[PDB]
Amino acid sequence: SHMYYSYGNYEAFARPKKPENVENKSAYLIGSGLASLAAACFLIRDGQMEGSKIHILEELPKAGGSLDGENMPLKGYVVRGGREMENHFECLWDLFRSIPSLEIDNASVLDEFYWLNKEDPNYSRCRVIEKQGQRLVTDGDFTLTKTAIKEILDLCLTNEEDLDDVKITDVFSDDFFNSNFWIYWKTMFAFEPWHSAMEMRRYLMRFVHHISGLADFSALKFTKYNQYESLVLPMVEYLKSHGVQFEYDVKVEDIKIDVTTSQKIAREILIDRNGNAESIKLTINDLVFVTNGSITESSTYGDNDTPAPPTDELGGSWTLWKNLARQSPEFGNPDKFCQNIPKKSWFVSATSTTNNKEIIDTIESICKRDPLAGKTVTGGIITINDSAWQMSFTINRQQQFKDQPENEISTWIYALYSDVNGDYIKKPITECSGNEICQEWLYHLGVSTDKIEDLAKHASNTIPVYMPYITSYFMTRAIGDRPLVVPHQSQNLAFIGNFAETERDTVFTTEYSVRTAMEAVYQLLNIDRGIPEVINSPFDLRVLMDAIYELNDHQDLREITKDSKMQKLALAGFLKKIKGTYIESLLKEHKLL
Amino acid sequence: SHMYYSYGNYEAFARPKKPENVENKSAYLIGSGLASLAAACFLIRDGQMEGSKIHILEELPKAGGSLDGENMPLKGYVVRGGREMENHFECLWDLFRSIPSLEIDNASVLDEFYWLNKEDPNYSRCRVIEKQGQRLVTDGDFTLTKTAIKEILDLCLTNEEDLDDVKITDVFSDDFFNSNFWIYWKTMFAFEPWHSAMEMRRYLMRFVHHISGLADFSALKFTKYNQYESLVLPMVEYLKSHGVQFEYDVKVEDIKIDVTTSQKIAREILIDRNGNAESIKLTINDLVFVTNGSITESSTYGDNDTPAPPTDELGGSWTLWKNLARQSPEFGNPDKFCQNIPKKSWFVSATSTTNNKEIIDTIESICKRDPLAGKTVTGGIITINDSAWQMSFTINRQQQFKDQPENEISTWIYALYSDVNGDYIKKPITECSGNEICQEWLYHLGVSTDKIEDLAKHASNTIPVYMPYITSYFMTRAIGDRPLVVPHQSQNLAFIGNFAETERDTVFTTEYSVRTAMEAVYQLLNIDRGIPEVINSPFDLRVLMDAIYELNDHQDLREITKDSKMQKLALAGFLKKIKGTYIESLLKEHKLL
Ligand SMILES: Cc1cc2nc3c(=O)[nH]c(=O)nc-3n(C[C@H](O)[C@H](O)[C@H](O)COP(=O)(O)OP(=O)(O)OC[C@H]3O[C@@H](n4cnc5c(N)ncnc54)[C@H](O)[C@@H]3O)c2cc1C
Ligand SMILES: Cc1cc2nc3c(=O)[nH]c(=O)nc-3n(C[C@H](O)[C@H](O)[C@H](O)COP(=O)(O)OP(=O)(O)OC[C@H]3O[C@@H](n4cnc5c(N)ncnc54)[C@H](O)[C@@H]3O)c2cc1C
């Protein structure tokens, strides 16, 4: 193609030559989420494109998209969701080592993040609770049977090309869905049983190097504040310092694209700049980066006394992608992702803010840390295993908002099941006000029922959010439902974000938006530098040995095959062949012998 | 330990916090070769130690050590040797992305190197010649038998701990030593048959990712000029710009070190600053970095009419290490490396400089490129397979010296066998003047015998070098013959360079001197940043598949087991199990099916 994949320090530390003819080129980016902001950064840093020639078109009043986090007027503090990150976000760390921190002088976002997560390393002291505040007895074990582990491996051993439209329930049976592994997995990643087995396979291979840090979240890393303040604003400042044009309340309705037998060229961007319909006409030297689709599109907000009103509106993002899909099948199949979403699916998240000491003290007694100490609190989500909603909640380092009073915590809450009565509040989450969500949560923390209503109604402000498309990334798909980052024969059109198509990597991650942004800029501008591949961990023998050990809850190879002689016989035969060799040493080194 | 290994961009791009109490610390570095210069750079950049507190002590009049390259007065142009490098010199590229280029403004040594090797990618058009100038018929094939390949794998499958004092001839039989593979291997890496099987195993695993670029040198990368001008001088300028003290003609005779039951502390450096004997007394906050041993120590130089005089002098480097070994067995076993070196071993290298058109035209006719064009010429060494000396020669990009006339080439020549009469000059190389080495070389290029003596004597200036210890890295060794980079309980003493002990990596490489330098600085100062591991290629399934394909001269798995039914039966059984799975896809992707 117009790019190549690499790994290692040589390509990481190298600077690309200024790409050819970039002086006569411009860039239009549809949306101002993380993908578009990352594409613009690469355009500045590695494309050496003029800032004033880069135009970011956003339909909302501000930037960031799904990376939001704000004190919403007449409502309260809101996080549409948190962001778990990890060391092997290979592209995203390439980007943010070049973004100046807004807190620490002469340091980058990576530096401040790197130091913070060493000062205050993330881990969970309590991962799963049940029976109104009691820690799950087996918390920390995966409780996978040998049958469940085999299905996990059969899935990874399945070609991606054979998982078209296959569901997670099509490839796993009873034992797996009964495991603690599935509890940790489905909740930390927001998988539903009807979601894409293809994506879940991508996930099993993508984070295999962190399976030992799965139950305790010790592989997770977190920014200092919410992702708007810690990621979006550093990017915007950097971009603004280079003269990049930001255009808000501009809704891209369509892009007219010539798809001939030899070329795809974007010709005109049909926009609605606040009520009025206008156009931007393009040449071949005007590059268009489309964030196609969005999980946060058409979001509604409730308040402490009002449910967030459910909706099925196709907003601008999904109507744009549909209008583009009308012009070539190579531009993807939006309806696979925005249509026929089950009403059981996750729709609602809520931010519960309180300074009340009974609430805060109850959270301390479950998570074993002071929620107001300024460090890790829950270390990630706590899952209420036996909750009807399949609800989970987390308290990040407090306060997640620079402007927030230092005696308040904000708790983020979400529910995997949206069409089921709660256990204390006898309604589905979609039917619930802020305070009713809070009440159902407080009940599962063991708060005395005598106090739940008053603590929720009067000692807390809880803002709910209804997101019709929050599960849209994971909908069952076929190869081809997502456009290439640079479709075949495209001259000036790229698709970026978590609905574009690239190899191996996992969607529902910020890394995917930076990778697609990076690959699009590199291909359209023919930048002469490698793109870091998705980390090679599933091909690494040492990581595969570790995974066998971890998946079998820390049993060596003799314990594993202990009670099946057909496999035990082969082990003895295997050990005869490898005794006194380097394979026996590696296996011992990774606790398999 | 006081360090950890990592890989990936997160650790690569991160900056370490200023280490604790570094303000009250100093550094003494014994030698000014690449290791010491690299240790000082890391001390400046990542240790944030004051430059004026860093003291580099060198016995020679200038810096660089084995990285030399100069117009030696009354002699001629000399390169003690070239430097093949590769992309996965993980530590060295970490270092040199921080070293400013002396040619390109606002660019680093890595940048200029990275760009140059893309502008002018290295490859050989002619790797092995014989019969006075004819290309080897099988050049490009490895001509390994299945028996030779099995021995290669049995070696890698042997624990390092079981190769103590084992020779290369102890683990390989006839077929291997008859292969083209061994021709390429022994000459590009300067292995002798009596050298350490342990190191050769380390080499097989270390560069397994480049086995496809072995015969044509397409994996090699080269600096613009000789390594003194392109590597040493950029470092010195950087170091000097930070106030580092350089001390020349200072010979370190001994370091007094307290080795107690609980600590090793260096107390005093006994020096000879030009004739006079002096001392430097140390506290625990004075760090000492010892480059122990040297392959270039005690080098003698001839000229066009005089042999370089053979020697067996222990110079300052080997006497220093012996004096240190007298103080603890934990400081290594110098005699394994500087004593009992076979007289057949490589001792002599020579730089032949000429502007003569018959010589230059003859080289063009073998290497197929214009030697004076300013780009790649031989792409690496050309090996004269049927030469009694087992001689090889290379012409790098010309001119290798910024000051050299643009109508001259310099050819670097070396011989693996030092005690055998040449085929045209009937003497061992050690007995030969500059011009006699040149004459023997010219004969193997097909130069008409009528012209050889005059072209060598009068149309060329050839400077020979006698290096008693040039093969010293590869001498058979046991675990323990080399000190840890930071010996157990050392407080202020580290050993650096290619005679120190670290995991997996290969000596006779510049990467090893930067890695040992990096690890020593990081351990003694407790720098809070990862050290990049030796590249994980021998654990990568995809690289192991490629190696099977390449080692079997590009045969798939059916061709390989074609004529052994005991293995063919197992293949059929293997293929039954994996058909329609992702393993079958990977194998096809890597040409094994
Ligand atoms: C609740 C939640 C939790 C998450 N947790 C994690 C996590 O733990 N770890 C992780 O790695 N990732 C997480 N993510 C994912 C990450 O936040 C998203 O993947 C990422 O922000 C996607 O960014 P994007 O730029 O690709 O698109 P989006 O974030 O969806 O942004 C699209 C933007 O474009 C604008 N736009 C859309 N259509 C149009 C149009 N037609 N015209 C003009 N403008 C338009 C929108 O206004 C929006 O600003 C989470 C996301 C959510 C919602
Ligand atoms: C001919 C040749 C070809 C090579 N080719 C390659 C190649 O292709 N690729 C590759 O990666 N590497 C190659 N190398 C290796 C690389 O050049 C060396 O590994 C590297 O330079 C070692 O540096 P060092 O600092 O570890 O020690 P040295 O280079 O040996 O330097 C030691 C220095 O310390 C000084 N010193 C020694 N003892 C004392 C003392 N007692 N007191 C004071 N000062 C002292 C010496 O004067 C010298 O300057 C080659 C080396 C040679 C000789």
Residue numbers in the entry:
A (entry chain C), B (entry chain C): -1 to 591
Q: What text does the study give?
A:
Flavin adenine dinucleotide (FAD)-dependent bacterial oleate hydratases (OhyAs) catalyze the addition of water to isolated fatty acid carbon–carbon double bonds. Staphylococcus aureus uses OhyA to counteract the host innate immune response by inactivating antimicrobial unsaturated fatty acids. In this study, we deduced the catalytic mechanism of OhyA from multiple structures of S. aureus OhyA in binary and ternary complexes with combinations of ligands along with biochemical analyses of relevant mutants. We conclude that OhyA accelerates acid-catalyzed alkene hydration by positioning the fatty acid double bond to attack the active site hydronium ion, followed by the addition of water to the transient carbocation intermediate.
The substrate water is the focus of a hydrogen bond network that includes the Glu82 side chain, the backbone carbonyl of Met186 from the α7 helix dipole, and the hydroxyl of PEG400. The contiguous electron density around the substrate water reflects the strength of the hydrogen bonds and leads to the conclusion that a buried hydronium ion is created at the active site. The buried hydronium ion is stabilized by an interaction with the negative α7 helix dipole mediated by the carbonyl of Met186, both oxygens of the Glu82 carboxyl, and the terminal hydroxyl of PEG400. Curling the substrate around the hydronium ion positions the 9-carbon of the hydrocarbon chain within 2.8 Å of the substrate water. When FAD binds, the catalytic Loop conformation is altered by its direct interaction with FAD, and the Glu82 sidechain is repositioned to form hydrogen bonds with the substrate water. An overlay of these two states shows how FAD displaces the nearby water molecules and rotates Glu82 into a catalytic active conformation connected to a single substrate water molecule. The xylene ring faces a hydrophobic wall formed by residues contributed by the fatty acid lobe and is stabilized by a π–π stacking interaction with Phe506 and a cation–π interaction with the Arg81 guanidinium group on the catalytic Loop. The uracil nitrogen atom N3 and carbonyl oxygen on carbon atom C4 form hydrogen bond connections to the backbone carbonyl and amide of Glu82, respectively. Comparison of the positions of PEG400, oleate, and h18:0 product shows that PEG400 is a nonreactive substrate analog that adopts the same curled conformation in the active site as the substrate and product.
